[PDB]
Structure formats: structure tokens, C-alpha cells
Design a protein around this ligand. Structure first.
Ligand code: HEM
Ligand code: HEM
Ligand code: HEM
Ligand code: HEM
Lengths: 146, 141, 141, 146
């Protein structure tokens, strides 16, 4: 068993009230200023010279929404996450050689961004269910073989 | 390196943490233990019932320890030379956990003072929290 | 943080490196490529024949780049803001390799100036080499 | 094939001229001041408060020699290193929970300590053969299962 019905509830319900645009863009922009070296992977996204520039960069906004939409694929099928991020794994690994621990940094910002947005509703238990999900995602995006 | 910018950003956040050192400290440990069950193994002798007495009391100890580092921000090591040997030499706590705790705390701040935890501010106290962890884990600088 | 102690220790070592920037730089890359074959993949267009012309010439470029950081030791970033974007954004060199190079160099120093590479000195330039790598890999400090 | 006869030669011959006492003690004392946090694992070894104290500590000297004698077990049988460090693996892992990357830090100091001692004889190729050996050792000292 990957998740429990209790966790599934925390994931699905919380995900239902999530605005992919705002949260996704917030998570990406925050990842790039808090952990500046992740910028290297984003060479074609224009201006990333300052926190303010990142926050107003439109390519960052757009890509941030696509990331959060991707997190939506995991939610739709929690027990098959691995197979879902199969394509994205080879892209993030084989093609775009990304350090595996970066998927973890990005899961940490998303959780913090979710906490800032949902406040007290983002209880310890709800957070626990989301750590498993973001953790499950980061893992699946790092393939060693096949 | 903690720039004057980080320093002040740290002080502003701590002005909103002061007067809640017990509440926030108690919630910090709660998320840590609930979100990362493995961190509980360091506390076999605690009545770890989600929100018990020892959780809130230990929580206050930790968050108060943080506040000290905020006072002596310029020389965090010295103001923690005691806890360092505890966590480093005696307890020999796995360094990863410090990041999980530092993380658990930022999540508490996001909940109670989201507008304040701006990205530039987030960057600051996360540089400060890493400065604190390195000390409690011992490093040649 | 680089203490005045580290600073001077770095300068003393570099006084024995100066006047050999090409020889030591050439031997630094040689050990790197020979001891860690995977680092060669970054140089497809080089005549990597153990000790060729491009190895010694590139070696001198690297060791000279180091010397600069020794001159501007107080503000290593600025004196490398150019190479940082190169290695970080353009080349996107895996950060590990910087440690392999920093290591390859300490091995050269051990060979030619063992008595000088004392433990306290070893600690210093290894703190300095990490200061250099972080810059060429980009970090919020 | 783990090693080549050429590497075997570099390992065995160089090892023959090695003084376990001096090199072993040098490697351990250097590991503890260059990477101070490795001291935590050595709580019963007395005074480790200063570089000078470490260098003169007798428990460090003694243990440093036992470490280098251990590296001698790898040399005697290069193709069976893993089976040799079987006991030491469980000790360093299961018992003394040591970070795996520390065995690597210790292999880096030994190589540097060997270079300082053997000078120009510690050629790139000789160093290459020793990296494989110290690397092989560090690896074998980190068991995940069984
Ligand atoms: C673990 C959470 C992550 C998810 C769910 C995710 C999702 C995605 C998606 C959906 C795309 C494709 C967008 C497109 O079609 O162009 C993508 C591409 C990309 N990702 Fe991620 N990603 C994650 C983490 C990361 C991390 C940690 C990095 C590096 C620090 C990264 C760097 C990139 C880059 C550079 C691209 C290509 C950009 C482009 O198309 O111009 N991603 N990712
Ligand atoms: C910001 C990081 C941390 C701070 C400021 C902190 C602070 C403290 C303080 C003030 C004490 C009380 C010491 C005394 O009474 O003399 C303590 C004890 C202790 N800490 Fe931490 N700590 C931190 C991180 C951690 C982590 C990550 C763990 C591991 C999961 C941990 C495990 C323990 C344990 C097992 C004790 C002894 C508790 C007892 O027996 O009452 N600490 N800490
Ligand atoms: C102390 C660390 C390093 C220093 C000081 C350094 C310095 C330099 C310098 C000065 C250049 C010449 C740039 C120019 O002509 O504009 C260069 C280029 C380059 N570096 Fe590094 N470097 C370091 C580490 C590394 C590492 C670890 C690698 C990866 C294995 C690497 C890969 C390259 C490559 C592929 C080039 C371009 C060479 C060419 O096309 O001629 N560098 N570096
Ligand atoms: C990879 C190279 C290493 C080798 C060949 C090695 C070898 C040994 C040997 C032979 C012993 C047993 C001595 C005895 O019987 O007491 C030992 C124990 C020990 N090792 Fe290592 N070791 C290595 C790396 C490390 C590292 C990286 C650490 C931690 C930073 C470490 C920490 C310890 C400690 C704390 C003991 C027990 C000390 C005692 O008996 O009082 N070792 N090791």
C-alpha cells in the first residue's frame, strides 16, 4: 500500500481547492531565489537576475503552472505515480541531467507554499500526506536503469 | 554568509515569533514527528502523544535556543557551544534531521505569518537556520 | 568563513605555486583526467594525450584563475563572476567535479611542497578551494 | 575484472614501502582536523580540541595504524575486498552509524598523505590505482542489505 484512504482524502480534497496558476508560479519563483543554483537548469527563461525579476518573469509563471499540473497527474492515480512520471523521469535525468536532490528542494518549497496559502487547514497530518506525495514524485523522477 | 539584510530579516521574523515561543515550538516538533516518524527514535523516553506535555516543553526549549542565536546572530557558534557538543558528540544526531526540523519550522511560519515569509525573507532565515544546524553538528567553518 | 589565518596560509602556499602556474596547472589536469576518466567528457575537442599542448595551456588558465582568487581573496565572487556563468549556466558542469579538481590540486601540492602542506595549511586552502568552487557553481551565500 | 596487473603492481609495490605506523597515524590525525565533524565518531579518544592536540594524541596514533593495517587486507586480496571488509562494514554501518561519504573523505586524505610522502613516485597512474583501491574499500564499508 502506497497511501492510506486517510492520506488520499488529505491529498485529493486539498488538491481540489488548489489554483495551479498561482501556487505553481509561486513554487517555481520561490525555488529559484531560495536555491539560486537551480537557475542553471533554466537558461532560456530570460531574466532571473533578481528576486523581483524572477517574481515578474512570465516564462517562470507559465512553466510554474505546468509543473503543478504535472503534480495533478500523481493525484489522479496515487498507486501508479512511477509509471506516470516515466517520460518526465528520462527528461529530467537522461536528457536534462538534474541533480536528484533538487526534486526534493522543489517539494519542500511547494509544501511551504501550500502552508502559506491554506494556513491552519494545512494540519500536520495533511502535511504528512503531502510529503509522501511530493516525496513519491521526486523519487519517480530519478531512474537509475530502464 | 549572513548579510545585514539576512540579519534584519531574521530579526523581523523573530519579533513575530517572540510571544509564541511555546506555541510555535510545540507545533514545530509536532510536524517534525508527524511528517517524519523516524525522528521520534531519538526520544524513546518521551510521552510522544501528538500534543503532550513533554512535546510542548521540549518545543519551547528548542525555539528558545533559536531565539538565543538570533540575539547573538553575529556569533552563533559561541552562543550554542553547549548544544553543539550535546547534539554532535553525545547524541550524534544524523545531520539530515536538522534540515527536517529547520523545514518543519518554516512551515509553521508560513501558516501563521505567510505575508511576512516573503521569498527574500524565506532566503534569509533559511540561511540562518543552516548557520544554526552547522553549529549544532560541528564544522571547521 | 575564511579567517585571516586561512588567508595568509593561502598566500604562503600560493607564493610557492607562483612561478610554476603552468607546470602545476598541467599536472593538476593530468591527475584529474587520469584518476577520474569521466571528467574528460567535458573536453571532446581537446587533444587529451596525457601531456599535450592543450592540457598544459588549459592547465595554466585554471591555475591562473586560482591565483586571481588569491589576489582578490576578500571578494572571490566578483573576481570570478565571469567563469561562474561559464561553468554554472553555460557548461552546467556537475559540481562534484570541482571537488575532484580541488582534490587533484592538493595532491600536486603534497608532491612538490609536502612540508608546507601542513594540516592547518591543508585545512585553509581546502576552505579556500571550496569557496572557489561554490562561486563557479553559483550559490546564494 | 576489478583491477589490472598494471594497477596491481602500483598497489602492491607502493604498499611494500609503506610504514603503517607513520602513514596511518598521519592519515587519521589529518582527517580529524581537515574534516572536524568526523570527530563526533571518536568520543572516547581523549583530547581532540586542537590540531596540535590531535597530532600528539596517542589514541589517535594507535588507531591510525590499525586503519592502515586494515587497508593492507584489501591489498593482499584485491578481487575479494568486499568479502574481507564484511565484518568492518556492519560495524561502521549497523553499529557505528557512520555517514558513507566519510569513508571517501578518509580515502582522499590517505591519497594526499601518500603523495606528500612518496613525492614524484606517486605518479598520476599510481594515484589512479590507489583511488580505485581506496574507492573499493569505502564502497565495501557501506552495506544496504545482507
Ligand atoms: C519534482 C517536481 C517536478 C515536476 C512535477 C516537474 C515537471 C515538469 C514538466 C511538466 C515539464 C515540461 C514542461 C514542458 O513541456 O516544457 C518539466 C520540464 C523541465 N523541468 Fe521540471 N519538474 C519538477 C522538478 C524540476 C527540478 C527540480 C528541476 C531543476 C532544478 C526542473 C527543471 C526542468 C527544466 C529545465 C525543464 C525544461 C524547460 C523547458 O521546456 O524550457 N524540474 N518539468
Ligand atoms: C534548530 C535545531 C535544534 C535546536 C535549537 C535544539 C535544541 C535543543 C535544546 C535546547 C535541548 C535541551 C538541552 C538541555 O536541556 O541541556 C535539546 C535536547 C535534545 N535534542 Fe535538540 N535541538 C535541535 C535539533 C535537534 C534534532 C534535529 C534532533 C533529532 C531528531 C534533536 C534531538 C534532541 C534530543 C534527543 C535531546 C535531549 C532531550 C531530553 O533528553 O530531554 N535536536 N535540543
Ligand atoms: C578551480 C576550479 C576551476 C577553475 C579555476 C576553472 C577555470 C577555467 C578557465 C579560466 C577557463 C577558460 C575560460 C575562458 O577562456 O574564457 C575554463 C574553461 C573551461 N572549463 Fe574550467 N575551471 C575550473 C573547474 C572546471 C571543472 C571541474 C570542469 C569540468 C570537468 C571544467 C570545465 C571546463 C571546460 C569544458 C572549459 C572550456 C574549455 C575550452 O573550450 O577551451 N572547469 N575553466
Ligand atoms: C574507509 C577506511 C576505513 C578503514 C580501513 C577503517 C578501519 C577500521 C578498523 C580496523 C577498526 C577497528 C579497530 C579496533 O579494533 O578497535 C575501525 C573502527 C572504528 N572506525 Fe574505522 N575505518 C575506516 C573509516 C572510518 C571512518 C570514515 C570513520 C568515521 C568518520 C571511522 C570510525 C571508526 C570508529 C569510531 C571505530 C571504533 C573506535 C574504537 O574501537 O574505539 N572509520 N575502523
Amino acid at each position: 500500500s502506497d497511501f492510506t484512504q486517510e492520506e488520499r482524502q488529505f491529498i485529493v480534497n486539498l488538491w481540489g481547492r488548489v489554483d495551479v496558476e498561482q501556487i505553481g508560479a509561486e513554487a517555481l519563483a520561490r525555488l529559484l531565489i531560495v536555491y539560486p543554483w537551480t537557475q542553471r537548469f533554466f537558461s532560456s527563461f530570460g531574466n532571473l537576475s533578481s528576486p523581483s525579476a524572477i517574481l515578474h518573469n512570465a516564462k517562470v509563471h507559465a512553466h510554474g503552472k505546468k509543473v503543478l499540473t504535472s503534480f495533478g497527474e500523481a493525484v489522479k492515480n496515487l498507486d501508479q505515480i512511477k509509471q506516470t512520471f516515466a517520460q518526465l523521469s528520462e527528461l529530467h535525468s537522461d536528457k536534462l541531467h538534474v541533480d536528484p536532490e533538487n526534486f526534493k528542494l522543489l517539494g519542500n518549497i511547494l509544501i511551504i507554499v501550500l502552508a502559506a496559502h491554506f494556513g491552519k487547514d494545512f494540519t500536520p497530518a495533511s502535511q504528512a500526506a503531502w510529503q509522501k506525495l511530493v516525496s513519491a514524485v521526486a523519487h519517480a523522477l530519478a531512474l537509475r536503469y530502464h | 554568509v549572513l548579510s545585514p539584510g539576512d540579519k534584519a530579516n531574521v530579526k523581523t521574523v523573530w519579533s513575530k515569533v517572540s510571544g509564541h515561543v511555546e506555541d510555535y515550538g510545540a507545533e514545530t516538533l509536532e510536524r517534525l514527528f508527524r511528517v517524519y516518524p523516524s525522528t521520534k527514535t531519538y526520544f524513546p523516553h518521551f510521552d510522544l502523544h501528538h500534543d503532550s506535555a513533554q512535546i510542548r516543553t521540549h518545543g519551547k526549549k528548542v525555539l528558545t535556543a533559536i531565539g538565543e542565536a538570533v540575539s547573538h546572530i553575529d556569533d552563533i557558534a559561541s552562543a550554542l557551544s553547549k548544544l553543539s557538543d550535546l547534539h554532535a558528540q553525545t547524541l550524534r544526531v544524523d545531520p539530515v534531521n536538522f534540515k527536517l526540523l529547520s523545514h518543519s519550522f518554516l512551515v509553521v511560519l508560513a501558516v501563521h505569518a505567510p505575508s511576512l515569509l516573503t521569498p527574500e525573507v524565506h532566503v534569509s532565515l533559511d540561511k540562518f537556520l543552516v548557520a544554526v544546524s552547522n553549529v549544532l553538528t560541528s564544522k571547521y567553518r
